Symmetry: C3
Subunit: 114 residues, 3 copies
């Protein structure tokens, strides 16, 4: 699975080890080995939520399987909690797009996961 976070929160406001924490937390949440987890944090972004420039975040979680109604509700609770605690972003100013990818549409190591 791969998780990306785009936020207007300053770089200096991103705690050391945040990437490591995301990796471990996602490994547990998805049940996938951490070796397969990819995390990407993009701070200092020019963005707005509801017209406001208050702290916010636009995220995405791509996974081959492990995506569904209940699971996504669970991932959101987890991720919003992490963003609220580590970056001080209000959960109601966070959007997380979930993508259930087909193995044939994910390239890796010169081939695909098909």
């Amino acid at each position: 699975p791969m998780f990306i976070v785009n936020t207007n929160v300053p770089r200096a406001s991103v705690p050391d080890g945040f990437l490591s924490e995301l990796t471990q937390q996602l490994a547990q949440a998805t049940g996938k080995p951490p070796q397969y987890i990819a995390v990407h944090v993009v701070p200092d972004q020019l963005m707005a939520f509801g017209g406001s420039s208050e702290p916010c975040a636009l995220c995405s979680l791509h996974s081959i399987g492990k995506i569904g109604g209940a699971q996504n509700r669970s991932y959101s609770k987890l991720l919003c909690g992490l963003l609220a605690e580590r970056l001080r972003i209000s959960p109601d100013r966070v959007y997380i797009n979930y993508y259930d990818m087909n193995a044939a549409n994910v390239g890796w190591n010169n081939s695909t996961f098909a």
Copy 2:
């Protein structure tokens, strides 16, 4: 709805109030409450369109519904117009990917829209 614009146009060329204008126009165009509109602009990017480094833009518009043949054409007319007028980018050097998201695949406020 969430709109993202990646462009090689410099930061200084993005006019004040641009994010604000995008939010309103999208609110109007989508028929969605302004408070739920998210906008993200990423200037100074290393990109090419048709092999050329002249001003260009790669964008995305995600929305739960309100995505379709006629609606997308209307959004494109609107958004290319804004990019041409505000960022001086030719409409024929702009790509906009539209995504009709399922409510269950959009996280927000510790849960999802399902």
Copy 3:
């Protein structure tokens, strides 16, 4: 077709002519004219793959058609080949999400490709 690569490799490590090479190779690979190919490279990113901060890349290839099991495997060999040779990124530290887009869902030149 549009290709985006996000990587923690530094900007100085991206060789001159990289965007042009991607443009040409993707035109050759997809069979589409180079005039339609868009490429975007984002270096110096804050990311981890498998819990490690060694060179890695998170990419996406969007295309109207020309996406499939065998074609995607071919694109992955080509793109990982380029990332390894030009950016010194190990193929097993690269993810490429492939998206087969409907023409009606791709905006360009004030309208869509429908």
